């Protein structure tokens, strides 16, 4: 994340860290046994046994005291996902339950994030938070150690699909957030991570409305980050989550 600061330990209980082989991705706990991430992180289709999910983590790849490590029972990429356009860039991870039949062991540092309403009409007005362990700048040598978070405004599709910004590239199922003047954005290694935005309707007032997907550069002017519109896939999430 560029233009962001370190996030406090209790700030992000829903964020998930995904490890396998030499790769890394983030994700969001949407239910005690379910993690929502980006499909392009798994386009290589690595075996589930290889996969490791760590919840309640603050420092990337560091063991910690409320850290919980879980195996992945199975995962599902969206059927219509394109590795070229990154359309439908979302995937479900089914966590492996233990002997007690529990997956995630909920605590103040490990909690699921509320799914979005979707029925609400989002103005540019909506403010969001983006989080990740990715690069802090485009040229950055290494991923961040501490979790970085940044405040970004939601951006309308009509403005987004504009020629000046992203133009034709934006497709249904996609949403944008950030400042056209740039400065604050998601960055490579942030993929799969959460975009939590304000929902005044909701009782929790904050819902997962985006999955970090793609973009051009970090924080470049007129090039806001592109996310998967979680609200667009509620039926799909309901359908395969229920499994």
């Amino acid at each position: 994340v560029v233009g962001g600061l370190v996030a406090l330990r209790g700030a992000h209980p829903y964020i998930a860290a995904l490890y396998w082989g030499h790769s890394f991705c983030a994700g969001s706990l949407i239910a005690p046994c379910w993690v929502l991430t980006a499909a392009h992180c798994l386009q290589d289709r690595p075996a589930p046994e290889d996969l490791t999910v760590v919840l309640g983590q603050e420092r990337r790849n560091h063991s910690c005291e409320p850290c919980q490590t879980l195996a992945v029972r199975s995962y599902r990429l969206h059927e219509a996902f394109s590795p070229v356009s990154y359309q439908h860039d979302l995937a479900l991870l089914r966590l492996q339950e233990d002997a007690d039949g529990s997956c995630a062991l909920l605590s103040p540092y490990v909690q699921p994030v509320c799914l979005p309403s979707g029925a609400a009409r989002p103005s540019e007005t909506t403010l969001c938070q983006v989080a990740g362990w990715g690069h802090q700048f485009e040229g950055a040598e290494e991923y961040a150690s501490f979790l970085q978070e940044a405040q970004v405004p939601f951006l309308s599709l009509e403005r987004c699909s504009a020629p000046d910004v992203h133009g034709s590239s934006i497709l249904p199922g996609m949403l944008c957030a950030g400042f056209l003047e740039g400065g604050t954005d998601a960055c490579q290694g942030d993929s799969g991570g959460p975009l939590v935005c304000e929902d005044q309707a909701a009782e929790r007032r904050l819902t997962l409305q985006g999955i970090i997907s793609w973009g051009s550069g970090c924080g470049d002017r007129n090039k806001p980050g592109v996310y998967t519109d979680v609200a667009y896939y509620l039926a799909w999430i309901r359908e395969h989550t229920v499994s």
Partner: peptide
């Protein structure tokens, strides 16, 4: 206490 609803208010 208990869990807090994710439902719209």
């Amino acid at each position: 206490n208990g869990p807090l609803s994710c439902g719209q208010r």
